């Protein structure tokens, strides 16, 4: 054993499952994306660094909001992100027009991640190493959730994956406790985001998304650097 | 106020691990340990290593703070004159990273450490007087230097010939009876200098016969021989009565 | 190397179930649950896998899932594989309530999902369900019924349950404390506090890391009680008061 | 048995270290490239109570080994110290240790008063490794 | 090191590394083709070449320049067998944008649509990885010229100047200091950057016949391949 074969998922002798576990090892080798649940909104700060200076970040966008009031960021590998993007673009907009109203994001995380569950959990031939940080604003109280390839949805006030996942989670476990001031929570969340980050930080080296209760707003490297580094 | 600075340093000892991350404390705490202890005159080379450990933590901070930071560490290399860490620091990429004006004037100050050369030292003393003002303790740094360089110059003129007249040899050091000749007398107390002077005719005569293998290896054993008999006196007196 | 090949379809070779032996190993991995007999009601317990206080706890009931107004279930296993079974039986219980306009009896209900889980453990080389979820409710015939789902298709449904492999210490406790006709649901609730404080590895019965869900029979509402940590905290001081009272003897 | 006797020699000194403790005096440092073939009595507690695992240099020792290699060379730079911390840093690891000596051993290609910037990079680009890889793996 | 079927399938290694996909990365390198994609201010020039082992080689069919749309061309690398199959696909997916949406595609989404099914080619190993490489260009409204590249690992990619392939690693290294500058580029300057980057990679600088050079500029938005007459004219212009 073995013994579990596949369809929907592989086997382990002891715990979890082998095979796609190796894809889970690639999830930790993905692009780190921090996230923040602060007061009435959800903040998402990702990290994007191009290989050479010949690339302009104005083309490839790591933040692709599915809805006007719901953004998103990815922690993990490549286009398997963009695969669930167009999926959720089809998935979330179908449920939006079924009842004609958005309905609180709790049901959005229920339905949108339900097929994402099956899509990631069921055999895809090659596995999928893209996780997500789910956000939104519902009935005045927003939510910040964290999914994964294994299909376990979490809830965090401040979360991080990719790099710092060992350091930043214990960081936010100590310095951050319960719910704190909105912008003061963004401070310590960026302080641990620059922990393992490179010493060179520029407007194009990172990106910060924010989910307002008035709907999601995707920032740009211009206003990202003009805010603070140190953004608060 | 040194005791107040130690009490301020003691408060930084418990505050370093109190909060989560210093973020930079122990680097400054070791620097503060390289100040109060530098005035305490505990140890030189180790205190110079605290300026090296703090210089490693100085990477990517305010440059006006790092431009005056080399004033303390490179002048510390002037105080020691034998740190043995010269070649390590100054040849690295981190110490040479600063191309600015003031640090280039410190580059030749770090070169003045490899210089010594009193006749040159008395010259650059005025040229570096601008850097002399930023010296935290001006007395302790240059006094131990010039006092150490004294006997460094004294062992050069006394070395070639055994005995030397004290009137001519003191004309090079500019004075005789006030301090200098009393400092040579202190070197005899510290064993660094073996010789005797003459007040009447003014001639310092160097004579030595340190080794004696007949007296020392004998008398010490005879004193031990008394301990061999005294320990046996317990056997003697007890067996008889 | 006869059994070392990946099969999952046909059985093993001396007559023993090939994967079911390994499926019960995954059940004994990070599982927690308990059950006891109670008159005019029933009680269940849950345990939060992550004790980190930064969690939002917005999932409300998580290890306990409510499949019906009069019935609920307690998931022990992989949460990803179980969420498919949640809506599955929920729709099967809904299509039955749609057809007969009558609440689905838990006799055929439990056996329905057990046969649904059995089809995935039978053919097609499909991965078996490594999640064992409980069942609670009330019917017009046998009244209070307790069940436990198993991967092989033969349900572990009894009047008591063991989840997970670590609960084996509580099984010898439940058989010694076995009683009939006395409730007082709090008698078993105070006994369930002794289960978590002793048999379970986590002591002191951390409130935020566990959950207690009870169902009291009410006609015709049948109120399901999510506690959750509210008066469990005073149950901690209640069980510790019993421990402080027990040490007074000796 | 010539090999069987010399591992008794290793086990005899393994006994002599027990005759030292406790305590004064002895010191023994030891290094090996394979820890699987070691006898269980070697690393058993009571004999070696301190095991310091030499960490993989990774990225942290790169700039450290590039600082000591640039301090030994006369500068008189003529070679860019900027690019080497960027483009070769992406292909570094590895590029481990004496592979940097090959960059210095490829400096004999000159034929020039100072080794050209392409000679150091030629050894860093070959390797004769990868792929491609990282951003393509993301892809 | 390998364990199980991971040699024949695209599943990730214990280090989180793909196998069948990582072998297709250098499958383009075995094609022996260098296509550098550089974009100026108002224009973008693609430089490519070909080999003529036998005198019977026809310039028409062996030409590697492929024109997807009147305003949008492309170029491939690596094995040319799979490349033609992706060419007619890009014509079909662009026609769906013409049919359904009514207007010309920005081609930014064409790279996404092609790489999405290219990811399906990367999904199941039974349909083969299809190791052909695609490089795209086009014209978007008030965006000026554009440059795009897609290898058969299945993402959409484009930037100012991006080149990847067999020898394109040595071309992008020289162009970093060469392209900047980074000011308004004349047509003669863009062609000069095509030979100089080729002179660092190759330095053979053979007859302009064998090399194929395209251009996309805004005067008439339609894509046009440079005529052999003007290529030799700009070749003798940069070399005095």
UniProtKB/Swiss-Prot annotation, chain A:
Protein name: Proteasome subunit alpha type-2
Residues with Phosphotyrosine modification: 4, 22, 74, 119
PANTHER family: PROTEASOME SUBUNIT ALPHA/BETA (PTHR11599)
Modification type N6-acetyllysine: residues: 68, 169
UniProt cross-references to InterPro entries, sorted A to Z: Ntn_hydrolases_N, Proteasome_alpha, Proteasome_alpha-type, Proteasome_asu_N, Proteasome_sua/b
Intracellular or extracellular location(s): Cytoplasm; Nucleus
Coarse class of the protein's main subcellular location: cytoplasm
Induction conditions: Down-regulated by antioxidants BO-653 and probucol. Down-regulated in response to enterovirus 71 (EV71) infection (at protein level).
Keyword tags: Acetylation, Cytoplasm, Nucleus, Phosphoprotein, Proteasome
Post-translational modification remark: Phosphorylated on tyrosine residues; which may be important for nuclear import.
Effect of residue 108 to V: In a colorectal cancer sample; somatic mutation
Protein family: Belongs to the peptidase T1A family.
Residues modified as Phosphoserine: 5, 12, 14
Function: Component of the 20S core proteasome complex involved in the proteolytic degradation of most intracellular proteins. This complex plays numerous essential roles within the cell by associating with different regulatory particles. Associated with two 19S regulatory particles, forms the 26S proteasome and thus participates in the ATP-dependent degradation of ubiquitinated proteins.
Gene: PSMA2
GO biological process, one term: proteasome-mediated ubiquitin-dependent protein catabolic process
Top-rank taxon: Eukaryota
Organism (species): Homo sapiens
Cellular compartments per GO CC: cytoplasm; cytosol; extracellular exosome; extracellular region; ficolin-1-rich granule lumen; nucleoplasm; nucleus; P-body
Gene3D superfamilies the record matches: Glutamine Phosphoribosylpyrophosphate, subunit 1, domain 1
Swiss-Prot record, chain C:
Name of this chain's protein: Proteasome subunit alpha type-4
Predominant location: cytoplasm
Residues annotated as transmembrane: none
Modified residues (N6-acetyllysine): 126, 175
Pfam families named among the record's database cross-references: Proteasome, Proteasome_A_N
Main function: Component of the 20S core proteasome complex involved in the proteolytic degradation of most intracellular proteins. This complex plays numerous essential roles within the cell by associating with different regulatory particles. Associated with two 19S regulatory particles, forms the 26S proteasome and thus participates in the ATP-dependent degradation of ubiquitinated proteins.
Subunit structure: The 26S proteasome consists of a 20S proteasome core and two 19S regulatory subunits. The 20S proteasome core is a barrel-shaped complex made of 28 subunits that are arranged in four stacked rings. The two outer rings are each formed by seven alpha subunits, and the two inner rings are formed by seven beta subunits. The proteolytic activity is exerted by three beta-subunits PSMB5, PSMB6 and PSMB7.
GO biological process terms on file: proteasome-mediated ubiquitin-dependent protein catabolic process
Family that this chain belongs to: Belongs to the peptidase T1A family.
Signal sequence interval, chain numbering: none
Keywords assigned: Acetylation, Cytoplasm, Host-virus interaction, Nucleus, Phosphoprotein, Proteasome
Swiss-Prot record, chain D:
Residues carrying N6-acetyllysine: 118, 122
Subcellular location: Cytoplasm; Nucleus
Family listed: Belongs to the AAA ATPase family.
Self-association and partners: Component of the 19S proteasome regulatory particle complex. The 26S proteasome consists of a 20S core particle (CP) and two 19S regulatory subunits (RP). The regulatory particle is made of a lid composed of 9 subunits, a base containing 6 ATPases including PSMC4 and few additional components. Interacts with NR1I3. Interacts with PAAF1. Interacts with TRIM5. Interacts with ZFAND1.
UniProt function note: Component of the 26S proteasome, a multiprotein complex involved in the ATP-dependent degradation of ubiquitinated proteins. This complex plays a key role in the maintenance of protein homeostasis by removing misfolded or damaged proteins, which could impair cellular functions, and by removing proteins whose functions are no longer required. Therefore, the proteasome participates in numerous cellular processes, including cell cycle progression, apoptosis, or DNA damage repair.
Protein's name in the database: 26S proteasome regulatory subunit 6B
Taxonomic path: Eukaryota, Metazoa, Chordata, Craniata, Vertebrata
Gene name tied to this protein: PSMC4
From-to range in the entire protein, with total length: 280 to 418 of 418
From Swiss-Prot, chain E:
Protein role: Component of the 20S core proteasome complex involved in the proteolytic degradation of most intracellular proteins. This complex plays numerous essential roles within the cell by associating with different regulatory particles. Associated with two 19S regulatory particles, forms the 26S proteasome and thus participates in the ATP-dependent degradation of ubiquitinated proteins.
GO biological process: positive regulation of canonical NF-kappaB signal transduction; proteasome-mediated ubiquitin-dependent protein catabolic process; proteolysis involved in protein catabolic process; regulation of inflammatory response
NCBIfam families assigned: PRK03996.1 (NF003075)
Lineage: superkingdom: Eukaryota
Residues found modified as Phosphotyrosine: 155
Name of the protein: Proteasome subunit alpha type-6
Keyword Signal on entry: no
Protein family: Belongs to the peptidase T1A family.
Chain positions found as N6-acetyllysine: 98, 100
Record-linked Pfam families: Proteasome (PF00227), Proteasome_A_N (PF10584)
Annotated disulfide bonds: none
Subunit structure as annotated in this protein's UniProt entry: The 26S proteasome consists of a 20S proteasome core and two 19S regulatory subunits. The 20S proteasome core is a barrel-shaped complex made of 28 subunits that are arranged in four stacked rings. The two outer rings are each formed by seven alpha subunits, and the two inner rings are formed by seven beta subunits. The proteolytic activity is exerted by three beta-subunits PSMB5, PSMB6 and PSMB7. Interacts with ALKBH4.
Alphabetical list of CDD domains matching this protein: proteasome_alpha_type_6
Coiled coil: none
Modified residues (Phosphoserine): 13, 59-60
First-listed, main subcellular location of the protein, grouped into a coarse class: cytoplasm
A Gene Ontology term for the protein's cellular component: ribosome
Glycosylated residues, chain numbering: 1
Keyword set includes Repeat: no
